[PDB]
Structure 1
Amino acid sequence: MNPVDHPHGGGNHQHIGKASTISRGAVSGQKAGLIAARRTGLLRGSQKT
């Protein structure tokens, strides 16, 4: 998309350009990407407690 439509929009290449992890205290219009993420990247292991 273009900048007007989404935080990720725009640029002469498609790219996010700032961290995609967003605070829990962000406001509507900012919460796109990974909200309040404890970590990110490929989970090497089992998810069970």
Structure 2
Amino acid sequence: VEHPFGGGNHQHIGKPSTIRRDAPAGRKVGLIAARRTGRLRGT
């Protein structure tokens, strides 16, 4: 009820944390409009 990531019998997200830019408020959490999501290697 508090967050779209909350709930479950394990502390886990359960959905891709990368979210589109034109998402409604209350859903647009996590990594907003992300082009890539990893450890920065190189440039």
Percent identical? 74
Aligned residues: 43
1:22 corresponds to 2:6? no
Q: TM-score, normalised by structure 2?
A: 0.93
Q: TM-score, normalised by structure 1?
A: 0.83
Superposed structure 1 runs of 4+ greater than 2 Å apart? none
Query: What is the Cα deviation at residue 45 of structure 1?
Result: 1.7
1:5 corresponds to 2:14? no
1:33 corresponds to 2:30? yes
CA RMSD of aligned residues (A): 0.7
Structure possessing the higher relative contact order (Cα contacts under 8 Å, 6 or more residues apart) = 2
**In the aligned structure 2, how far is the partner of 1:36 from the partner of 1:15?**
21
Structure 1: where are the runs of 5+ without partners?
none
